[PDB]
Ligand binder design. Structure first.
Ligand SMILES: Cc1cc2nc3c(=O)[nH]c(=O)nc-3n(C[C@H](O)[C@H](O)[C@H](O)COP(=O)(O)OP(=O)(O)OC[C@H]3O[C@@H](n4cnc5c(N)ncnc54)[C@H](O)[C@@H]3O)c2cc1C
Ligand SMILES: Cc1cc2nc3c(=O)[nH]c(=O)nc-3n(C[C@H](O)[C@H](O)[C@H](O)COP(=O)(O)OP(=O)(O)OC[C@H]3O[C@@H](n4cnc5c(N)ncnc54)[C@H](O)[C@@H]3O)c2cc1C
Lengths: 636, 636, 93
């Protein structure tokens, strides 16, 4: 219809929870979800975990992502314009992400320094979302929420190889590193996949499609880019306008359709999508809205400021050819793909495709001794942020059974990638609209690495994860092309594939073992009995790793902080109930509200923010949340 | 975690019973299971029965096994060094074995000469562990235990061929040779495979993973080598020290983590693993420890003595090309392997891969007539040991529908092997550590055949099993190459493949039937009418079999007796409750404790010992065991 | 182009190539493929500009180490032990 009670704008995790919970809470309450991206209901290119890699392809076909490029070349990235993609589909990140189950640490929530957002406070909500389907030796998880969490159809043999190697450098094993209390140790790494169906646990099918199947009070509009929030004379949100996804209107004319909201408007268009809708509605930096010809509804300079992410490095390593990897699946080899697709359809609960192949990893924290070697500028932060926060980790590290890279730019053979990310970076970016027009790309700045304290931890990670690589059974060398530019004579120089392994790739090849060019220093053949010693590094080596970082550091899609929940004189954007200052009947519930980072893959978090905002809206509307939620399609 | 109540060392079946039963009797009881090898949970190379054969490959890739090699060469095996492998995975033998369901005879347990270990005393515990999923005409088997037993998905046509042949040489058919009573009979042979799911009945999934799914008191540390047991001032067991599987630390330098036990320390690291743990803890031969510089805790010289095993011989026969066998699958013929893997995924309840293809066999016992033909030294052992013990078989004999043998040394075509073993050897061995280091190999000595009584029965078997093969429909010849070196004109000399079978193998080959070299004596082509009479043997022939026994006899992986349960003054190591003499809170519960051999494939034996040890620790801690156990994953 | 190439290659030019007009400095040829270990190359198709220095200044040596005709001798390519050789190859690239 034209009018409804609640409007959710952006169908990410947070938005899907809000829209679903409230609708199920009261069959009368007419509520509508509006999403720029397409509907994801029963799309095999969503519900199948194994194909997740393809969503980040800039190949002119894929449209499940929008790609936001740095407006200016960053000095700090030795000249590059950082790319930060985000989701453009119902379910948002939930429908396209890597599907790693990680939780933030207890202190991360405490450090929101807001009433109702303690660890204490959110633990029941954390439980309310989870359907934990794997063993653990603690009580910290939920067992009847709508979001399935499991170890997937099949862990890869490299997982336990990685663990054996982690142990050999003294990162301890743990049954569950997602227990809110841990910041140093290594686990078998769970996924958002239903143990029994092998399907991706996406927020849309869990919270929204569940309800639409059983009630008539939840309205879904997809392929609907939300332009702006229509305001009152009093700055009460009265409604919203939306346009077609594509700009394929005759003339390229703007075709707005207005939808009205009796009670509440909710913005859930994500860290990058929310502060644009606010801005072109009139809720932003005054000087900016003025320059674009936008009547100010509320002067909030913090709208689209303090853009926070996790900073990813990907260290790639060649592995033996009898190793199990995703490389040939990712390459598009037609009987490798025909096989896994078939396996999934016949036996999902055992299928390789019922996984992300990211089956092991650690949270890590530096020793006293190691801290000396890291920067003054990092040592400052240590004392400030980490020193007496023993439950906060500095780095992440996982092992992907396969290269997460353009295979069009990788030699033949098998690989593993050490997927790394900085947990609480000091650097900060921002995002601002360039026009009222909802189709024009905004201004954007990653801000990756513009604080010098963010280098030394990542550098420490490269070295650390490499010592794990070198001690794995499967290891057969570093991929020299994608590693730091070490001096060739340095004891820290890379060693690429060994001759035995190369010949197996191309056993009729005319070219294997031709030294002519000296493009790679070969590894010696693998010995089981080898006695291994740490790589020594110099200041020159460190300068190389530092440079490599600048050149190859990336987003982790764990974007937050662009509509911060802090006091307004500190530049914040929302209340402890997430209302937008200077307005009535408008909230932001998504990861934009975070005032500080969380040491975790942020799907868990976006869901928990969604759960908290569903409580805040429920008690404001005089409603109560039903447990359990409506049955989730295809679940046993 | 740093401290627990019970610590079980080694995740063999016995260990898995102990760790699982106790954690499930009392959810307060914090129990940790420590396992040298990797976790077997949902490994398709563990749970699919038909790939079991790969686990004994010495190919520098497979690591689900450790290989012990005799320190010295044995005169008795004509100068070779015996190789005894054992399991190196969670579940131990249960994850990698032949999955043959066999039980010992009643007298075997009675002959332990220990109260609480009578057949009578253990029969209820025998039934507790079994889930019997096949028909039989007795009341000897359990029906609600964790470990599922069946005839698998599909019996092979050679099974009833073998029985028809056994019948024709006077071994009678029986519904059940595993009734504790039968010593001379032939059955269809059952497997540790679930009838409904087609999955392997491994101890870990049944006892441990079942529990860990539903409680938080059972802790699992895999890839962790138990070095030594930590002792109190009064020889009480206070904890355990473990190191990583791989010795891949910086500078190969030792790294022990410690874990303390409040109540009990159980050892289940196997016949070969257990004694080693005792000896480097300071429990063993007083002199050996003195020289290795280990402080004595308890002088028990018989730690690592009385190594008993079952002695395997493998008689290979050629069969018709229309026979159905595992040979092409074992060779790696991709579309044979693809047809069988796929069949298992779609319908495990009837798949060829839901089997071990050891689908029939017999326990056998010699006549008065036959005894005379055996030695003086075996007739002596016959009177002393078998004469008034009629429920003990002398030899086990079964048919593998395929060649259990390196196919790299086999001609093309189809095979069946007669898998034979000696049920009670007189011959004896020993194992002792060489260092305080846990990474070093121990001094080892199989002891195979060092007792001359052990030849005659094996020679007797070769003759007997040959007469069966020759009377089969599938039989097309003896594989001369892998048979005893008979004189070529001896009426007992081998006849190999006939010409019609050979032409079938290579119908466009230029070489089939070239006599040049006279490398084989061809069989005459198959006649369904052929009258058959026993091969006669001379003394020279018998010598050729004796030598063939010395050359080709192996372990059956049924290793026992290295921490024996008898009075300490008879060189015993444990109480009638399995307490280590001269210590407090320390028990061996695995097959090490057995004072004598068992006429059985020893997975059943190890489980029972486990069930018994669980009873003994349950009454000592005033716990009560729950029946049924925790529901086993994927079971109906 | 001679100005780009530095003082130690100009001293060679005057000494060796100046009034010797039939002497080339660098050779260059297209190979229709990679001449390199394909084990170290991404997928796709390639060509290589195969380049070599016609008259290097750098010198090497080879002497035996034993009377035995099977032991490896001492060897020294001597490549680039004369800075004059860098500049023309750079110009080739
Ligand atoms: C490729 C990838 C990998 C990731 N890796 C992991 C991982 O390993 N583990 C993990 O747990 N999480 C991972 N995530 C992170 C996680 O998915 C995000 O933190 C989470 O999805 C963000 O939730 P959100 O509600 O704040 O916004 P989003 O999920 O981004 O959803 C915002 C939605 O709003 C819609 N929208 C935007 N603008 C408009 C508009 N104007 N009108 C209408 N609709 C609009 C978008 O189409 C989108 O669907 C990753 C994310 C991505 C993209
Ligand atoms: C290839 C094979 C074929 C067999 N065939 C059959 C058959 O056909 N039928 C049948 O019924 N049975 C069979 N068995 C025999 C049966 O499996 C064994 O007798 C039985 O498993 C022994 O049980 P256990 O508890 O005594 O020790 P094990 O099964 O040997 O298990 C010992 C465990 O302890 C671990 N370990 C060793 N040392 C240490 C240490 N220092 N620290 C920590 N952990 C350690 C090992 O990794 C292993 O997992 C076979 C076994 C194998 C391996």
């Amino acid at each position: 219809p034209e009018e409804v009670d609640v409007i959710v704008c952006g169908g990410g995790p947070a938005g899907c929870v809000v829209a679903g919970r409230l609708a199920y809470a009261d069959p009368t309450l007419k509520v509508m979800l509006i999403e720029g991206g397409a509907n994801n209901r029963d799309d095999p290119w969503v519900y199948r975990p194994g194909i997740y890699v393809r969503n980040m392809q800039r190949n002119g076909i894929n449209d499940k992502a929008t790609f936001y490029t740095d407006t200016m070349a960053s000095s700090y990235l030795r000249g590059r314009r950082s790319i930060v993609p985000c989701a453009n589909i119902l379910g948002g990140g939930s429908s396209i992400n890597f599907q790693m189950y990680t939780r933030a640490s207890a202190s991360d929530w405490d450090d929101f320094k807001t009433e109702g957002w303690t660890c204490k406070d959110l633990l029941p909500l954390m439980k309310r979302l989870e359907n934990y389907q794997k063993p653990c030796n603690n009580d910290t998880h939920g067992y009847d929420g709508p979001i399935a969490i499991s170890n997937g159809g099949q862990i890869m043999p490299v997982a336990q190889d990685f663990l054996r190697a982690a142990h050999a450098i003294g990162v301890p094993y743990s049954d569950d590193i997602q227990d809110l209390t841990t910041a140093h140790g290594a686990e078998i790494w769970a996924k958002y996949i239903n143990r029994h169906t092998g399907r991706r646990s996406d927020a849309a099918t869990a919270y929204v499609h569940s309800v639409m199947d059983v009630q008539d009070n939840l309205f879904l509009r997809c392929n609907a880019r939300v332009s702006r929030v229509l305001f009152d004379d009093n700055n009460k949100a009265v409604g919203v306008a939306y346009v077609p996804s594509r700009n394929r209107t005759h003339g390229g004319k703007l075709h707005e359709t207005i939808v009205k909201a009796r009670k509440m408007v909710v913005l859930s268009s994500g860290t990058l999508g929310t502060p644009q809708i606010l801005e072109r509605s009139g809720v932003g930096n005054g000087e900016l809205l003025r320059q674009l010809g936008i009547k100010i509804v509320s002067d909030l300079p913090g709208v689209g400021e303090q853009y926070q992410d996790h900073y990813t490095t990907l260290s790639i390593y060649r592995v033996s050819n009898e190793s199990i990897t995703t490389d040939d699946f990712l390459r598009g080899v037609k009987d490798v793909q025909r096989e896994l697709f078939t396996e999934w359809e016949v036996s999902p609960e055992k299928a390789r495709l019922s996984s992300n192949a990211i089956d092991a990893g650690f949270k890590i924290r530096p020793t006293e001794e190691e801290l000396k070697e890291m920067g003054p500028e990092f040592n400052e932060l240590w004392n400030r942020y980490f020193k007496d926060k023993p439950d906060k980790p500095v780095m992440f590290g996982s092992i992907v059974a396969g290269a997460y890279a353009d295979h069009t730019l990788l030699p033949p053979g098998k690989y593993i990638t050490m997927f790394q990310y900085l947990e609480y970076p000091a650097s900060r970016g921002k995002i601002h609209i360039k026009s009222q027009n909802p189709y024009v790309e905004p201004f954007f700045d990653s801000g990756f690495m513009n604080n010098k304290a963010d280098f030394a931890p990542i550098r420490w990670s490269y070295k650390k994860t490499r010592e794990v690589a070198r001690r794995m059974d499967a290891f057969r060398g570093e991929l020299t092309s994608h590693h730091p530019r070490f001096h060739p004579a340095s004891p820290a120089a890379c060693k690429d594939i060994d001759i035995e392994t190369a010949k197996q790739i191309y056993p009729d090849g005319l070219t294997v073992g031709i030294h002519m060019g000296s493009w790679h220093q070969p590894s010696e053949p693998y010995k089981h009995d080898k006695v291994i010693e740490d790589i020594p590094y110099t200041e020159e080596d460190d300068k190389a790793i530092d440079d490599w970082v600048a050149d190859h550091v990336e987003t982790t899609w764990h974007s937050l902080g662009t509509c911060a929940m802090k006091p307004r004189e500190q530049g914040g954007v929302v209340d402890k109930r997430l209302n937008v200052y200077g307005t009535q009947n408008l909230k932001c519930v998504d990861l934009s509200i975070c005032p500080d980072n969380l040491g975790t893959n942020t799907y868990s978090s976006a869901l928990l923010v969604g759960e908290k905002g569903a409580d805040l809206i429920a008690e404001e509307l005089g409603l109560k949340i039903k447990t359990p939620h409506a049955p989730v399609p295809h679940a046993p």
